[PDB]
Curated annotation (Swiss-Prot):
Protein name: Tyrosine-protein kinase BTK
Oligomeric and partner information: Part of a complex composed of EEIG1, TNFRSF11A/RANK, PLCG2, GAB2, TEC and BTK; complex formation increases in the presence of TNFSF11/RANKL. Binds GTF2I through the PH domain. Interacts with SH3BP5 via the SH3 domain. Interacts with IBTK via its PH domain. Interacts with ARID3A, CAV1, FASLG, PIN1, TLR8 and TLR9. Interacts with MPL/TPOR.
Catalytic residues, chain numbering: 119
Part of the intact protein present: 391 to 659 of 659
Sites where the protein binds dasatinib: 74-77
Reported impact of residue 140 to P: In XLA; growth hormone deficiency
Binding site for ATP: 18-23, 37
Clinical note on disease: X-linked agammaglobulinemia: Humoral immunodeficiency disease which results in developmental defects in the maturation pathway of B-cells. Affected boys have normal levels of pre-B-cells in their bone marrow but virtually no circulating mature B-lymphocytes. This results in a lack of immunoglobulins of all classes and leads to recurrent bacterial infections like otitis, conjunctivitis, dermatitis, sinusitis in the first few years of life, or even some patients present overwhelming sepsis or meningitis, resulting in death in a few hours.
Start and end residues of each Protein kinase domain: 12-237
Domain of life, source organism: Eukaryota
Binding site for clofedanol: 74-77, 140
Tissues with expression: Predominantly expressed in B-lymphocytes.
Outcome of mutating residue 81 to S: Found in patients with chronic lymphocytic leukemia; uncertain significance; results in resistance to ibrutinib therapy; results in a protein that is reversibly inhibited by ibrutinib; disrupts the covalent binding between the enzyme and ibrutinib and
Function: Non-receptor tyrosine kinase indispensable for B lymphocyte development, differentiation and signaling. Binding of antigen to the B-cell antigen receptor (BCR) triggers signaling that ultimately leads to B-cell activation. After BCR engagement and activation at the plasma membrane, phosphorylates PLCG2 at several sites, igniting the downstream signaling pathway through calcium mobilization, followed by activation of the protein kinase C (PKC) family members. PLCG2 phosphorylation is performed in close cooperation with the adapter protein B-cell linker protein BLNK.
Length: 241
C-alpha cells in the first residue's frame, strides 16, 4: 500500500476535462480543488512514486493515488500551462521576473535533493489562480532547451537543467515565443555548437539578460547553480523594484 497517499476514488467528483492519460478538474469531498490524471500501468504510477518524496511550494504537489480500483491526484492549477498563460493572459516586467523566481525556487529545491528534471520548459510549468508558477511534469526531444554537451553526447547534469532554465527565462520574457523561432531543431543544434545564443527579449533589462545568458556558458562547470541564480534574481528584483 501507499499508506497516507491512498485516496478513496469515491471521494472524488469530476467537473471538467483539462487535457487528454486523461486529466480532469474536480474536488475531494467537495472540500479541495484537485486535478485528477487517469491512465503501461506500472510506469504510469512511477510519476506519483517520484512525487511522494518531493514537496515544495513552487512544485506541483501530489495529493494521493487510487491504485486498488488508476488515478493520480494533485493540487489544481486553475490558469493551466505557463506557455499558454504567457501567450493568452495579461504583464508588467516585474510579474515576469516573479515567474522566473517561482521556477528558480522550485529548481533550487530540486537541486538540493540532487534531482534532475530533464525537461524544464514553459510547457511543463503550470499557473495557479493567483498567477503563481509551479514546476510540473517532473515525475516523468527538447533540442531548443538543451546544452551542447547534451546534444552531442547525452551528458545530463545539474548544469543541463541550468541551461534549460535560462531558455525558460527567455520564453517568459519573450511572452511565449518558441526559442530559435526561425530555425529547425537540426539548425538550432548546429548554431548552439557555433556559439549562437538567444537574443535579449525587449522586455528583459540588461541585468535580467545577464542572468539568463549566464545559464548558456559553453563550459558546464562555468554555469551557476540555482542557489546563485536565485540570489541574482532577488538582487535584480530589489534593484528594479
Ligand atoms: C505536503 C504533502 C501532502 C500535501 N497534500 C495536501 N492535500 C490536501 C491539501 C493540501 N495538501 N494543501 C496544502 C491545502 O492547502 N489544501 C487545502 C486547500 Cl488547496 C484549500 C482549502 C483547504 C485545504 Cl486543507 C489541501 C501537502 C503538503
Ligand atoms: C487547451 C487547454 N484548455 C483545457 C480545455 C485550457 C485549460 O487547460 C488547463 C487548465 C488547468 C490546468 N491545471 C492543471 N492543474 C494540475 C495538473 C494539471 N493541470 N495537469 C495537466 C496534470 O497533468 N497534473 C498532474 C501531474 Cl503534472 C502529475 C500527476 C497528476 C496530475 Cl493530475 C496536474 C491545466 C490545463
Amino acid at each position: 500500500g501507499y499508506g497516507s497517499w491512498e485516496i478513496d476514488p469515491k471521494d472524488l467528483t469530476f467537473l471538467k476535462e483539462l487535457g487528454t492519460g486523461v486529466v480532469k478538474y474536480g474536488k475531494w469531498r467537495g472540500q479541495y480543488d484537485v486535478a485528477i490524471k487517469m491512465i503501461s500501468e506500472d510506469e504510469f504510477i512511477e510519476e506519483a512514486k517520484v512525487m511522494m518524496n518531493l514537496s515544495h511550494e513552487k512544485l506541483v504537489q501530489l495529493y494521493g493515488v487510487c491504485t486498488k480500483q488508476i488515478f493520480i491526484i494533485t493540487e489544481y492549477m486553475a490558469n493551466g500551462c505557463l506557455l499558454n498563460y504567457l501567450r493568452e493572459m495579461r504583464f508588467q516586467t516585474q510579474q515576469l521576473l516573479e515567474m522566473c523566481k517561482d521556477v528558480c525556487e522550485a529548481m533550487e529545491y530540486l537541486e538540493s535533493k540532487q534531482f534532475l528534471h530533464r525537461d524544464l520548459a514553459a510547457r511543463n510549468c503550470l499557473v495557479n489562480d493567483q498567477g503563481v508558477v509551479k514546476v510540473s511534469d517532473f515525475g516523468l526531444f527538447p533540442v531548443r532547451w538543451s546544452p551542447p554537451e547534451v546534444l552531442m553526447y547525452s551528458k545530463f547534469s545539474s548544469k543541463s537543467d541550468i541551461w534549460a532554465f535560462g531558455v525558460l527565462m527567455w520564453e517568459i520574457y519573450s511572452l511565449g515565443k518558441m526559442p530559435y523561432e526561425r530555425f529547425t531543431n537540426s539548425e538550432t543544434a548546429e548554431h548552439i555548437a557555433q556559439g549562437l545564443r538567444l537574443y535579449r527579449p525587449h522586455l528583459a533589462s540588461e541585468k535580467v539578460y545577464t542572468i539568463m545568458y549566464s545559464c548558456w556558458h559553453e563550459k558546464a562547470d562555468e554555469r551557476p547553480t540555482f542557489k546563485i541564480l536565485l540570489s541574482n534574481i532577488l538582487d535584480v528584483m530589489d534593484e528594479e523594484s
